[PDB]
Every structure is written in C-alpha cells, then in structure tokens.
Amino acid sequence: SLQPHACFRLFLTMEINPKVPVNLLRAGRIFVFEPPPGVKANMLRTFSSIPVSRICKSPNERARLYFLLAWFHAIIQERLRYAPLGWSKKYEFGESDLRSACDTVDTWLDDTAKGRQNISPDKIPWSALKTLMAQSIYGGRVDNEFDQRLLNTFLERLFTTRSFDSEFKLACKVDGHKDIQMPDGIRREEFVQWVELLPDTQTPSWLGLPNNAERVLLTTQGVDMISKMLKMQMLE
Amino acid sequence: SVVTLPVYLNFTRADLIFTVDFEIATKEDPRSFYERGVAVLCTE
Amino acid sequence: YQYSLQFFLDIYHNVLYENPNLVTDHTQRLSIITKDLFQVAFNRVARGMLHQDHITFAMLLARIKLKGTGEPTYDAEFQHFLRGNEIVLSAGSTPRIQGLTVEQAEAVVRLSCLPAFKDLIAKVQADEQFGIWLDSSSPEQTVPYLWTPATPIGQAIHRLLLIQAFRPDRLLAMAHMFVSTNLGESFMSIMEQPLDLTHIVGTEVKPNTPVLMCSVPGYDASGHVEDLAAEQNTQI
C-alpha cells in the first residue's frame, strides 16, 4: 500500500519454513541460499568472499595458503553431502569457521613474517595453523574421535605440500592414471584462473571417497526428478 | 602397520560400539583407510 | 515460490527493452528475444530455486522449446521416459543375464515396448564388444547405437531412454547434456558462478518489492547483506 523512494530495498532474511505466508512470498523476489555444489563453485564463492586487498598483502606466500584453506573448506563442505561417509554427523560447517581460519592465518603470518616479502617454506607456522584449526576452529564442532582423526589426516596431508614444492598431488581424481596436482602459480589471479580451469565433471574420488558413494544417491534423485514430473504432466 | 576401525550398530553410524585393530596389506596406505570411511556395521 | 503475473511482466520488461548487441532486423530480433527470454526466465527462477529442482525446470524449458519448434515431436518416447517406472511391465520374462542384472533386464523389458527399440534383446548380445559403453565404466560420454534419419534432439532422447534403462545413476548427466544439446552448452553455466548480489539488487528489484533472502538452516546470508551495504556505502 506504500510508495517508496526508488533507491530502497527492504531485505527480509528467513529460514525456509511453512509459517512464511504465501502473500509475502508472492510480494517479493526470493533468493535461496544453499551450500554450493562442487569443489570448483565452492572455491569460486570462497575466493569471491575474501577481498583482493586481504590476500594480496605482504608476504607473497599468503595467496598459496589462502588457496590451500579454500581447497580444505571446499572439500570439508562437499564431504557434508555424502553423509554418513564424508562425516559421521551433519555438522554446520558455515562461513564463520572459514572467517576465523582466515583471521588466524593472517595473524600468525603477520607474527611469523616480520614485514618480509617472502619466507623460505620451512619457517611457515605449519604446526600452529594445524593445531589451531584441528582443535578450536574446525575441531570445535567435532564429536567423534574418528572424525577428529579424519580431520587431522586431511590437515596433515594438505598443509605439508613438501614445503611448497611443485608437482604436489592434491588428491586422486581418477583411480586410473589421473590426479589433481598443485598449481604452480605464485599469485591470486593464477589461482582464480586455475579454479576456472577445473573440469566441471567430478567424482566423490576428488575428496578421497570411493566413486560409488554418490552413486545410488544419484539414482535416487534421478527418480526424484521423475517424481517431480508427476507434479507437472499430470497437471498438463 | 595397523589400522583402527570403529564398529557401528547400523548404516546410520550414530552408535559406536567398539574398535577393531586390523593389520594392513603390503601395498595399502592407512590414509586411504582413514579417508574412505572404512567402518564395520553389525546390522545390515 | 509462488510467482505472480507481475514477476513475469517484469521479466518481459527486462526482455523487450534490454537487447544485448543492439541489430534492427526483425528476423534476428525475434530469435534474440526468444533466447534472451528463455535464459533470463531460467536465471530469475533458478536464483530462487533449490539445486535439486534446477534440472526439472530445465527439463520443462526444453520441453516447451521442443513443442515450440518444425521438429519431429517424439512424444510417445517422452511419455515412456516420463512414466516408465509407473507403467506395467511384463511378468516372468527373463532376458540375458550375460552382463545385465535382473533390474536392468526388467528395464530392458519395459523399454522394448518402444517401436524404435524393438530388437532390444538381440542388440545387447550383438554388441558384445561394447561391454563398457552400455553398462558399467563411465557411460556419460559414449552411448552405443541409436533409436532411419533421426534428429540430434531425438538422438538425445533415445540416449536418455537408453541410459535410464541401463545406467540410472547417470540420469542427471544425461539431462544436463540433453539441455546442452537442446538449449545451448552454456545455458545453466551462470548458476555455477556465485550470486552477484549487487547488480540484481540494484537493477532487477523494484523498490516496493522486498528482497526475500531464504536460507537453509546452517547457512545464512546476513553478512552478505552487511557486505553489500558496506561496499555500496549505504546505511542499513
């Protein structure tokens, strides 16, 4: 019933619930937020969340650690879909944990690199980042000891990189004669264009799972799509 | 080496029972066994 | 999502007056308007749609495009694809169990009622060398045989029916490449990218129309609106 100023938008954020009235759903443009599908799209959203000024600061090895943190966040959020093999519980691995991990990375890199442009890879605080993320940041939501063991295994595999050596395997995409190797770019733009150079096909084997872990589930949602057909063509 | 595997009550894996230590083969890796979610289910 | 008529009219106001590469020849202008309409309707719905419901909307868009096309409408094959699980199959008939299981054999029995797929049982034993493309391995790229001169849309429908009979976990990949062959290989590739909130809020949203920010539990977007107000120097 009201005419507003033109450059104004009323934002109404809410959870997807039946108690939201259909009149207000009719009244507004709806945008739905979900955990993004795929490692590539999740890492694109993560790199879009971090501003360019934060990552391009001194030292020059900040971008490699930010790429590793984005890859770790992407694989532990994409493992949430394949419950109960990716994680034994449906944890809420949101963005606050990623922001706290970024803050600890920035603070410990300012503490270690005393204004230097670059560090030899032996002197990077590996153990501080590993323990502070495995016990407080990402280990805070962990209940089972086996989930903590899996998190520690992922952090010990990911954060070594043979001390930033090239030809480092991130994972094994195909069991037959294929793997995902570490990009050798030394800047943020190289990492973004390497994210966009990822093949859009994926297996659960990107995350270390067996390839069949999604398989039956995929069949289920295929039939689910067919079930949704019974809502349209029956009404057609 | 030797790998520790939990035993869950069923496929929902929400009820841990006890741990089993298993000897690994001559070519496998314990990181793959920790990564793939290798567990034991009693009711299946 | 309960879309009104005014949402559709705002879509058309973004169709008729927002012409990319603006051509002044009506023969090109009609096709440009049609493709722009289909893409902007898919984008403005799938921005407010869960990812599980994207491929059903893409299927409906492809069906509307096919019914709007001259093109041989394979609607009997469409009906058999759309209701093959709910239709009655034969009882007591056992095909070859050479490389196909009992459920696969039952699906071949159901698919043998199609007129193009009439010599189905002889086809799975004549093509003994293609033990990987039809069943097992990765049947995403290669599909054996065909449904006579057939359209690529009809060939895609025949491949979709063959996969739904044979390898039902890759049904969503078949639906994705069916949309890619029907509507364009980059039709839904915008949805892999993160939500550019700035342009959609500043341009596509009316002032008296609120921005509804629906969120799944465990993944909210309050900080998204905070960052949007922070970058644009607006006070919320």
Side-chain angles (χ1 to χ4, degrees), chain A residues 1-14 16-144 146-161 164 166 168-172 174 176 179-213 215-233 235, chain B residues 1-20 22 24-26 28-44, chain C residues 1-20 24-73 75-84 87-88 90-95 97 99-105 107-109 111-126 131 139 144 148-154 156-157 159-236:
Chain A
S1 291
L2 273 206
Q3 53 88 22
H5 184 51
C7 278
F8 148 75
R9 283 101 170 90
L10 162 62
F11 297 89
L12 307 163
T13 173
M14 87 276 268
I16 308 169
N17 261 338
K19 29 183 79 163
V20 192
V22 291
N23 245 343
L24 192 160
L25 299 159
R26 189 105 35 172
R29 291 238 179 177
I30 295 149
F31 305 98
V32 180
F33 266 87
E34 208 206 359
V39 184
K40 177 175 169 194
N42 205 353
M43 266 156 74
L44 269 189
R45 200 217 283 263
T46 296
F47 268 116
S48 98
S49 62
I50 291 154
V52 200
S53 64
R54 194 141 140 191
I55 177 169
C56 283
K57 226 187 219 174
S58 291
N60 283 12
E61 269 68 32
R62 172 99 53 88
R64 320 259 313 264
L65 280 196
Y66 265 24
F67 159 72
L68 273 167
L69 182 56
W71 175 269
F72 179 70
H73 183 93
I75 62 172
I76 71 138
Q77 254 204 289
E78 191 60 45
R79 267 183 94 105
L80 262 187
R81 285 187 193 275
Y82 310 126
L85 294 197
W87 298 117
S88 310
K89 280 204 168 197
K90 293 272 203 191
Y91 309 109
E92 300 159 321
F93 285 125
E95 57 266 61
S96 187
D97 306 315
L98 176 63
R99 276 145 83 161
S100 295
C102 287
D103 288 16
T104 50
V105 159
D106 264 19
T107 308
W108 279 93
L109 257 288
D110 293 12
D111 289 323
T112 293
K114 266 83 63 179
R116 275 127 40 176
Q117 278 317 107
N118 44 350
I119 312 90
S120 294
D122 63 331
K123 291 158 196 161
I124 287 155
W126 300 122
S127 67
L129 277 191
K130 274 159 164 112
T131 314
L132 197 48
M133 266 165 14
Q135 283 193 355
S136 78
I137 300 165
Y138 279 125
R141 333 283 199 101
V142 170
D143 279 322
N144 306 17
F146 306 102
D147 284 337
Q148 192 56 48
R149 180 194 57 196
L150 174 57
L151 193 80
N152 291 358
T153 319
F154 262 133
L155 282 184
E156 269 135 20
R157 175 186 283 200
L158 251 56
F159 266 41
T160 44
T161 66
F164 274 167
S166 185
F168 177 68
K169 287 168 63 190
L170 271 185
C172 301
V174 193
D179 48 309
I180 315 181
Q181 76 113 26
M182 165 76 153
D184 47 331
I186 62 178
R187 269 304 307 273
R188 172 212 180 273
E189 297 93 296
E190 304 290 325
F191 281 135
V192 177
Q193 76 104 28
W194 186 87
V195 166
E196 281 138 18
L197 269 193
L198 261 169
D200 280 335
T201 187
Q202 99 166 43
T203 55
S205 163
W206 273 11
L207 317 97
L209 279 165
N211 319 62
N212 332 98
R215 208 262 301 271
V216 194
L217 174 83
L218 287 161
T219 308
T220 305
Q221 37 186 337
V223 184
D224 288 2
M225 181 209 37
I226 302 299
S227 314
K228 298 197 202 331
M229 301 314 209
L230 310 163
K231 280 99 180 172
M232 325 330 296
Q233 205 260 312
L235 265 158
Chain B
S1 283
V2 52
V3 188
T4 306
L5 302 188
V7 178
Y8 293 106
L9 189 47
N10 47 84
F11 72 103
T12 56
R13 298 155 81 100
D15 302 312
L16 165 57
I17 312 298
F18 72 108
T19 81
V20 179
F22 263 123
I24 212 170
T26 70
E28 300 278 347
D29 208 80
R31 287 189 148 176
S32 300
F33 281 110
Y34 293 147
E35 263 176 339
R36 289 170 100 96
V38 185
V40 186
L41 314 181
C42 272
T43 298
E44 203 75 20
Chain C
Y1 26 66
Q2 304 211 343
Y3 312 97
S4 68
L5 188 56
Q6 288 87 4
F7 180 74
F8 197 60
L9 296 190
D10 288 15
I11 277 184
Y12 263 79
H13 275 42
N14 272 254
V15 161
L16 294 173
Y17 315 122
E18 319 306 308
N19 190 275
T24 206
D25 311 329
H26 302 277
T27 58
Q28 288 265 25
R29 192 78 81 85
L30 182 59
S31 90
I32 273 177
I33 276 184
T34 299
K35 142 187 58 83
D36 179 41
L37 161 71
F38 272 41
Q39 191 136 43
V40 84
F42 171 73
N43 290 357
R44 273 161 203 240
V45 167
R47 278 299 187 201
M49 172 146 288
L50 288 162
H51 192 85
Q52 282 287 326
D53 312 343
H54 275 179
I55 209 61
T56 82
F57 190 53
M59 269 320 83
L60 284 159
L61 261 280
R63 189 194 91 189
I64 286 167
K65 169 66 75 46
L66 170 138
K67 214 166 281 168
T69 322
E71 215 272 341
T73 79
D75 300 348
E77 293 192 56
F78 201 84
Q79 182 52 251
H80 178 61
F81 168 67
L82 216 65
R83 277 208 305 164
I87 214 170
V88 47
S90 295
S93 179
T94 303
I97 317 81
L100 315 176
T101 83
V102 196
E103 285 287 89
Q104 270 175 301
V108 171
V109 161
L111 207 81
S112 56
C113 313
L114 273 180
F117 296 110
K118 194 181 176 174
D119 45 346
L120 219 48
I121 317 165
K123 259 156 188 279
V124 309
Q125 270 175 349
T148 201
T151 72
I153 304 171
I157 291 158
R159 283 155 165 146
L160 174 68
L161 275 148
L162 188 140
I163 286 305
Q164 201 206 29
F166 271 64
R167 194 90 145 138
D169 43 322
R170 319 291 281 161
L171 187 68
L172 302 180
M174 281 326 108
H176 281 112
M177 56 222 309
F178 172 71
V179 152
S180 301
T181 49
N182 208 9
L183 315 172
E185 305 266 347
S186 311
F187 182 54
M188 67 165 48
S189 196
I190 169 164
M191 281 324 316
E192 270 212 25
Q193 309 297 136
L195 203 178
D196 178 31
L197 193 53
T198 300
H199 184 257
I200 304 177
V201 154
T203 62
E204 327 188 343
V205 170
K206 302 307 146 208
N208 85 302
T209 292
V211 188
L212 261 66
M213 267 290 202
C214 292
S215 68
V216 296
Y219 197 93
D220 212 354
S222 289
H224 293 59
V225 196
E226 294 267 319
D227 290 354
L228 174 65
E231 300 328 291
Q232 284 215 329
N233 322 328
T234 73
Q235 288 88 81
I236 40 178

